């Protein structure tokens, strides 16, 4: 199971939002809350409108948290099955079909990062491969600088802490877009977690 | 471009036939179609009454008795979805009662095709017309106007669909398929709501290949069910189903009823095989005997006495007498007479030296038969004799009428012959001298008769015969040439002459002269009583001259360049006076002669003969022009001489006869024979029919060796041997290209001798071969001529050819010679002469050969199309290509590269069946519906434009470029074949004409009549998408401005301008014009 | 093997779209505007299935509103060097259409379908940067049997009928008039539509495992989507419109047309005929697009010569699911030419493969001789 974290309402115990993306999710079910490590109990779902205490994917809820950690969780986190739970870090590589821009992206670029829920700044540390989008030919040497249109597998850390996912392990959830000044610059798949 | 067609032949192919009461409730008619003709016959112990031309091709044909009318009333159904009732009157008119165009918008048509049929009762007529549609005609008198109503099928797939007698309510019984199998159903036409409602009855399974469906009368009533192995009768509840051995080996097509009863039925086969079929009597059994082969019967008619007229489409039409006492010869069938049938043409060629005659491939399997088709003047002979040497020949009157008496010359001699009926005797004529060459003889004025020899000129008693006055030259010596005729004789001695009169028991001399050199042909003849000019040619001089009698004035001299003047003549056609000069060399100069006035002017010259000839006044009741010479020559005239040639081996001599046993007859002398006949009255094509037994499929003419070349096609069963002796299992030599190291199809390479029409020499190509093309040449510098051949390699397991043959051949002495192969990789389509080099169609690729002195074929240049290289016609460097999917390909050779390279091109998906090069812009060819069309070559210059098309109704196989002809208005000539047997023409005319002759045209449509009420613009509109014809002119029409009466010629010309130097028209300028224009055919 | 239905129904793209049963066809002749994407060069069959992922606005705009009416839009035969002499062309219908705001972006999918061949007359340029297209539609002259005008009128009756005997038994049968035209049996039938589709369906049986039309007319447009022939031939074949005259320039190709060599370098073979199968229902060959809007006409052969590979097996957006590609190029030119397919599960057929796409072949028939 799998929900991102939209906000944190502070009602009777504590609540909270988001679209349920991974696996059903019972009534007084055992779930972790993730970047750092907190256990939680299931009280309320109140999923829509309506009560119904399990409720599966593509559904909007607002769960009602009972753990140590009551305030001090942040849009940007997500709630895991305690067993295969999610990555994190803030490291990865990326996929990165660039999209627009009035020249030239080089090495050392800051931008921010909606992940799923999150909102986090992050620098393009250096860039891999490039593509020609035409087959996917993964490009002989090494990048020095990426354009518009131009796609480019690359390097990015966040200067704070996400929790990833690599697109395909997760689709939803590594989907994510740099965004310069407003204007969307590029959509992006994540591939790998770096330590 | 601006063309003119014509009919030379009409089509000759029987579609369809029916017995009926049409002409005259106590006469019985044979109706016979004739595609787009109509001819009707009565019968007799036939006779022929009247034939006429559709604008359509006829697609059914039905007499029937609506309740309470004189006779029976026809019915014509064309391709073109053309409907009409027709009635005929007694001057004679077959009468448009009822018409209409019945075609639909939306439908596909019947694979099946068009079945038209009436109810017994005359209540409608059935045209199933397109799938899934029956269409009904109700005859009332409501429905005079095309009105129609369809009702619906369930069934698509309808093999034969019928109406059934005796039944209280219209009713349609027809057989056919679904995945289901074949079966047979009824309905009952619900005339008053339009619709089907459940019939009587319904049978399951039927034969699996049961195609026919007759419809018996009411002494039984229901019907009969035919296929491969079963006849199958069904009425109600009974079933009746023999399978006769009988009819095992082949199918059956046709058929009809013999007597109204029901009892007797033809049935035929598609292989002749003529069958009856018998009704047992209710109904208990059924009986089938054979009765012969027929020509091969596409439909049947009896008429009375045991007589039948079989219709065929391949071969010649018949008439059958058929016995009920066999003969041990075979069977019970007799034939009584051959109707010509220029039965599927396929290809032909043209020949011979002038003129020319034409020669086909015609007919096919049994029936095949080349066709010789000659455009003259046809004589009955009624008397041969063998007698040698005739110089001369008379005719006399021994008693005043009607001549009874012949006098004959040879080398100073004479002789008599007197007539009693069909029996020709010696006789001897008192006061005629029997040893001395007569030039002429005959009889004269005063009751008398003058004999004219070398020495003495003797005018004889009719009376208690004899010499009663006798004329001699002053000094003794020898007459030379001598003219005579009622009263006058002019008689000539070397270098001067004479003139006598006749008068009783004297003549009586008058005018002696001195020409300026010796005299060689005389002539006196009359335009009152007696001749006040006469007619003279030089023999130095070489000078027609017309003098005056007594005086013997000159006046005009026209000398002629030269060779000696051999005759002489003035006599007269319609109502102007001519002068004739038949030289040696064999010219004949023709004058335009006044006899008041003595003048000679408006020269024409023209040739019949490399012989001396000799020219012939006669009647039979206008005063025609026999000439003499190797081709003999009639004339006539309509106020434009016309000379036709006459069918017959040289005359020398000729005279008139008008005996007591030949009639208005023609007695001629060739050097070894005397015939007596009488002439027919204007010129016709005649055909010679050359049968084989087996399918030719090519011709050509070798002229060195005397010789047609022709490919052809028997029949045979496996073991290979054959049904019957064929034109290739019977020839004086016969080859073969392999030795011994269901059906089966052999090719020969036949030869042909051009006079006696044996086969010479049967080669037999491969196993598995096919002979597609064929050809005589002389190839590279050699002066053999050849007869090459090109095949392809025919297994059945493999879909395209992969292999054929470019087989040289040699005919030499008395045999047969195989020169030279090429393999090729392919099929040889077609093969051309082409600047000394062969030219071959191979699958998709033009390829030229050299021939080398080595005696072979090298390759010179090659090209690769597109289009599968079917067609090909050339003329100067250009090259023509044609694929059965009507695109069409100009190529240019070009010397200076040795290449060839694309001029023209042009691809319009239709079938094509052959074409033509006309000139080097324009090329005939006939796509699909019987249509013709033609392209025009004048960056974007290799397209070829369509500037014509036109609906011809014919299936065109072949075109050739000649005429029928002499020598010497139009542009160039193009006949051809056709399937339906016609032979039609093409020709170009000029801008100028084009104009006049389609003006023409709309003018004679809206004064003509058309046989159904159809509309000529549009049957001349080609068919599939539909246009109105362009670039063409229907002469078949332009020519029938003369077969109308003279009221109606000046409604046609009512308002024209007509081209000369240019004013108001007149009937007698079109007459004119409409002459010019039968004269090339 | 796997299932031959997969592949054609494009499962790549995305789960379920919203389909369209509708019809809307233009009849013949008939003087019609449609509008024409920029970017999708391709010359279309008929029949022919075509997915199309498209991006930009102006692209979007365009298509949303084509679901409303038509569905069909069209595509311009483009011979390179005609230079905006566009003249001929086809319809494409949309019988498929999912769009998703959930990645970041404006994204559309299709799935087009050709339906009538037409004639440019005359091209406008709105300003949005799609045109519009003045059309002339083309028809199709479908000729009736040979032997119909010289068909006998007696021997109509058994025109109709109920191994490759049965052939022997429809050629004396069927064309039996040919006697009376200027030619013999066995060349009508070279012309023959029932008997060249089934010389058609012999060439696609060593393709393996076969069903299809029973109208030539949908036959020859189909096959033709099978040819791998370069863009000024495949013309060629649109263009001629008679299904007989198209099934025949489609049997000359198949026959002839052995090698496959690279269109770069243009002389090193790449396959033969011998190495093309069946894969798809639709043929080997048909028409895949990959996650930037490109298509790729791309061909199913077991070996191919001359050819590297670079990177290593992906299974992202592939066409064929549970395949996986890697990309392969040209020896010699270095220029690309298809993908190197590998599988996953160990109990597939066609264990290895190459997917090929046609911008890079060149059919070419052997020697120096006919050629
Ligand atoms: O089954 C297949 C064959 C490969 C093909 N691919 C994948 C692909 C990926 C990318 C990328 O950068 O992610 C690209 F730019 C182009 C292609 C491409 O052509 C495909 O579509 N599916
Ligand atoms: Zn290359």
Redesign the pocket.
């Given at each position: 199971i799998r929900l991102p974290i939209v906000d944190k309402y502070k009602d009777m115990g504590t609540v909270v939002l988001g679209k349920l993306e991974s696996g059903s999710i019972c009534k007084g079910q055992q779930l972790v809350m993730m970047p750092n490590k907190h256990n939680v109990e299931v009280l309320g779902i109140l999923s829509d409108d309506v009560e119904t205490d399990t409720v599966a994917p593509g559904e909007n809820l607002k769960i009602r948290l009972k753990g140590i950690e009551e305030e001090e969780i942040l849009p940007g986190f997500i709630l895991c099955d305690p067993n295969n739970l999610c990555h994190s870090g803030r490291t990865f590589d990326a996929?990165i079909v660039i999209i627009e821009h009035k020249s030239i992206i080089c090495p050392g670029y800051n931008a921010v990062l909606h992940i799923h829920t999150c909102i986090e700044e992050v620098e393009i540390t250096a860039l891999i491969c490039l593509?020609d989008?035409?087959?996917?030919e993964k490009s002989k040497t090494r990048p020095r600088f990426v354009k518009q249109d131009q796609?480019c597998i690359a390097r990015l850390r966040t200067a704070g802490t996400i929790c990833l996912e690599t697109f395909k392990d997760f689709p939803q959830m590594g989907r994510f877009t740099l965004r310069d000044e407003g204007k969307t610059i590029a959509i992006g798949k994540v591939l790998k977690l770096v330590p | 471009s601006y063309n003119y067609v014509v009919t030379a032949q009409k089509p000759t192919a029987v579609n369809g036939c029916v017995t009926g009461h049409f002409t005259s409730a106590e006469d019985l008619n044979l109706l016979i179609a004739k595609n787009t003709r109509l001819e009707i016959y009565v019968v007799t112990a036939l006779r022929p009454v009247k034939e006429v031309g559709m604008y359509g091709k006829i697609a059914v044909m039905e007499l029937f008795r609506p309740k309470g009318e004189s006779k029976d009333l026809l019915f014509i159904l064309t391709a073109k979805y053309n409907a009409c009732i027709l009635e005929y009157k007694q001057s004679i008119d077959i009468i448009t009662r009822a018409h209409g165009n019945v075609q639909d918008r939306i439908g596909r048509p019947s694979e099946t095709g068009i079945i038209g049929i009436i109810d017994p009762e005359c209540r409608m007529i059935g045209l199933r017309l397109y799938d899934g549609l029956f269409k009904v005609i109700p005859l009332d008198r409501d429905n005079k106007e095309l009105k129609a109503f369809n009702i619906r099928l369930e069934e698509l797939h309808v093999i034969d669909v019928k109406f059934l007698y005796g039944c209280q309510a219209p009713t349609i019984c027809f057989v056919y398929q679904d995945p289901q199998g074949r079966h047979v159903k009824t309905y009952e036409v619900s005339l008053r709501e339009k619709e089907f409602n459940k019939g009587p009855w319904k049978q399951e399974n039927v034969e699996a290949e049961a195609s026919m469906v007759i419809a018996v009368p009411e002494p039984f009533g229901g019907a009969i069910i035919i296929g491969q192995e079963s006849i199958t009768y069904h009425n109600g509840d009974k079933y009746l189903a023999i399978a006769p051995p009988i009819i095992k080996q082949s199918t059956i097509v046709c058929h009809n009823r013999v007597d109204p009863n029901g009892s007797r039925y033809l049935l035929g086969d598609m292989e002749g095989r003529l069958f009856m079929l018998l009704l047992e009597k209710t109904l208990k059994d059924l009986r089938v005997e054979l009765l012969g082969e027929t020509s091969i019967a596409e439909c049947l008619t009896y008429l009375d006495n045991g007589v039948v007229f079989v219709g065929s489409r391949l071969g010649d039409s018949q008439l059958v007498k058929l016995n009920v006492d066999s003969n041990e010869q075979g069977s019970y069938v007799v034939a009584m007479e051959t109707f010509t049938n220029l039965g599927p043409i396929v290809d032909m060629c043209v020949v011979d030296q002038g003129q020319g005659q034409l020669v086909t491939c015609s007919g096919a399997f049994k029936e095949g038969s080349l066709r010789i088709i000659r455009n003259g003047i046809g004589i009955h002979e009624h008397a041969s004799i063998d007698l040698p040497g005739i110089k001369g020949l008379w005719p006399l009157r021994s008693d005043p009428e009607t001549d009874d008496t012949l006098v004959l010359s040879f080398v100073g001699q004479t002789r008599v012959l007197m007539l009693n009926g069909e029996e020709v005797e010696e006789t001897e004529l008192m006061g005629f001298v029997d040893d001395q060459q007569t030039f002429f003889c005959g009889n004269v004025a005063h009751q008398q008769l003058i004999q004219i020899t070398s020495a003495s000129v003797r005018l004889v008693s009719q009376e208690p015969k004899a010499l009663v006055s006798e004329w001699k030259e002053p000094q003794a010596k020898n007459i030379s040439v001598a003219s005579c005729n009622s009263s006058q004789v002019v008689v000539a001695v070397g270098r001067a002459l004479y003139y006598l009169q006749i008068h009783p028991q004297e003549l009586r001399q008058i005018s002696h002269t001195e020409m300026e050199h010796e005299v060689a042909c005389l002539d006196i003849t009359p335009l009152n009583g007696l001749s006040p000019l006469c007619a003279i040619g030089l023999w130095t001089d070489i000078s027609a001259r017309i003098l005056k009698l007594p005086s013997f004035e000159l006046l005009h001299k026209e000398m002629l360049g030269g060779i000696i003047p051999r005759s002489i003549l003035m006599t007269t056609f319609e109502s102007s006076h001519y002068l004739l000069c038949a030289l040696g060399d064999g010219a004949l100069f023709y004058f335009g002669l006044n006899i008041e006035t003595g003048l000679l002017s408006d020269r024409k010259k023209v040739t019949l003969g490399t012989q001396p000839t000799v020219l012939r006044t006669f009647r039979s009741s206008t005063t025609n022009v026999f000439a003499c010479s190797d081709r003999p020559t009639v004339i006539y005239s309509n106020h434009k001489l016309v000379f036709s040639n006459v069918n017959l081996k040289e005359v020398n001599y000729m005279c008139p006869l008008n005996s007591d046993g030949y009639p208005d007859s023609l007695a001629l002398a060739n050097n070894s024979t005397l015939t007596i006949g009488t002439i027919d009255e204007i010129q016709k094509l005649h055909i010679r029919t050359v049968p084989l037994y087996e399918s030719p499929r090519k011709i050509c003419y070798q002229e060195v060796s005397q010789c047609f070349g022709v490919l052809s096609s028997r029949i045979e069963v496996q073991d290979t041997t054959a049904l019957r002796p064929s034109a290739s299992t019977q020839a004086l030599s016969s080859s073969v290209s392999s030795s011994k190291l269901e059906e089966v199809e052999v090719h020969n390479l036949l030869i042909i001798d051009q006079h006696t029409f044996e086969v010479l020499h049967a080669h037999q190509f491969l196993q598995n071969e096919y002979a597609l093309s064929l050809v005589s040449c002389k190839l590279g510098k050699d002066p053999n001529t050849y007869f090459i051949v090109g095949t392809a390699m025919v297994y059945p397991e493999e879909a395209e050819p992969k292999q054929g043959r470019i087989v040289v051949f040699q005919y030499s002495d008395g045999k047969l010679q195989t020169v030279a192969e090429k393999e090729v990789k392919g099929a040889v389509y077609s093969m051309v002469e082409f600047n000394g080099k062969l030219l071959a169609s191979i699958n998709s690729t033009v390829r030229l050969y050299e021939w080398t002195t080595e005696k072979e074929l090298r390759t010179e240049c090659n090209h690769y199309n597109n289009i599968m290289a079917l067609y090909l016609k050339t003329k100067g460097d250009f090259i023509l290509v044609g694929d059965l999917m009507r695109s069409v390909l100009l190529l240019a050779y070009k010397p200076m590269e040795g290449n060839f390279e694309e001029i023209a091109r042009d691809f319009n998906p239709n079938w094509m069946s052959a074409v033509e090069i006309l000139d080097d812009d324009n090329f005939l060819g006939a796509e699909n519906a019987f249509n013709l069309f033609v392209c025009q070559k004048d960056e974007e210059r290799q397209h070829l434009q369509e500037v014509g098309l036109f609906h011809l109704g014919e299936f065109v196989n072949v075109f050739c470029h000649g005429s029928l002809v002499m020598q010497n208005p139009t542009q160039g000539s193009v006949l051809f074949g056709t399937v339906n047997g016609m032979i039609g023409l093409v020709t170009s005319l000029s801008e100028s004409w084009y104009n006049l002759l389609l003006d023409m045209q709309n003018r004679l449509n809206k004064v003509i009549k058309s046989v159904g009420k159809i509309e000529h613009s549009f049957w001349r509109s080609f068919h599939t998408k539909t246009e109105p014809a362009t670039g063409f002119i229907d002469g078949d029409l332009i020519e029938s401005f003369l077969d109308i009466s003279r009221p109606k010629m000046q409604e046609v010309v009512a308002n024209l301008q007509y081209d000369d130097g240019k004013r108001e028209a007149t009937a007698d300028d079109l007459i004119k014009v409409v002459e010019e224009l039968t004269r090339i055919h | 093997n796997f299932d031959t239905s997969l592949p054609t129904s494009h499962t790549?793209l995305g789960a379920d779209m919203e389909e369209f049963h509708g019809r809307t066809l233009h009849d013949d002749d008939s003087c019609q505007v449609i509008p024409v994407l920029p970017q999708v060069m391709m010359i279309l069959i008929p029949g022919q299935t075509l997915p199309l992922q498209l991006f930009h606005p102006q692209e979007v705009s365009m298509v949303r509103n084509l679901i409303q009416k038509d569905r069909t839009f069209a595509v311009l035969a483009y011979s390179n060097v005609q230079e905006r002499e566009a003249q001929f062309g086809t319809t494409a219908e949309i019988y498929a259409y999912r769009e998703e705001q959930d990645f970041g972006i404006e994204i559309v999918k299709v799935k087009a379908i050709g339906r009538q061949r037409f004639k440019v007359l005359e091209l406008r340029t709105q300003s949005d940067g799609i045109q519009q297209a003045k059309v002339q539609i083309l028809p199709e002259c479908v000729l009736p049997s040979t032997m119909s005008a010289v068909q006998l009128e007696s021997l109509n009756k058994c025109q109709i009928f109920p191994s490759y005997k049965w052939w022997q038994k429809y050629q004396k049968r069927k064309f039996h008039c040919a006697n009376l035209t200027s030619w013999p049996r066995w060349l009508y039938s070279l012309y023959d539509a029932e008997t060249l589709m089934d010389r058609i369906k012999k060439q696609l049986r060593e393709w393996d495992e076969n069903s299809l039309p029973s109208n030539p007319i949908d036959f020859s447009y189909r096959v033709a989507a099978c040819l791998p022939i370069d863009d000024v031939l495949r013309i060629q074949l649109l263009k001629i419109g008679s299904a007989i005259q198209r099934l025949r320039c489609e049997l000359d190709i198949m026959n002839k047309c052995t090698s496959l060599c690279c269109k770069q370098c243009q002389e090193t073979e790449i396959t033969t005929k011998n190495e093309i199968f069946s894969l798809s229902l639709c043929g080997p060959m048909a028409a895949?697009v990959?996650?930037?809007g490109?298509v790729?006409e791309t061909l199913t052969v077991y070996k191919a010569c001359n050819l590297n590979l670079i990177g290593r097996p992906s299974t992202?957006?592939?066409?064929?699911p549970g395949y996986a590609?890697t990309v392969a190029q040209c020896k010699i030119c270095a220029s690309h030419i298809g993908?190197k397919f590998t599988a996953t599960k160990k109990d597939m057929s066609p264990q290895k493969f190459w997917?090929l796409t046609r911008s890079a072949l060149l059919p070419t028939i052997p020697d120096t001789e006919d050629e």
């Open positions: 996929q593509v989008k035409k087959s996917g796609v | - | 790549y895949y990959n996650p930037h490109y790729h992202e957006h592939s066409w064929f590609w993908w997917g």
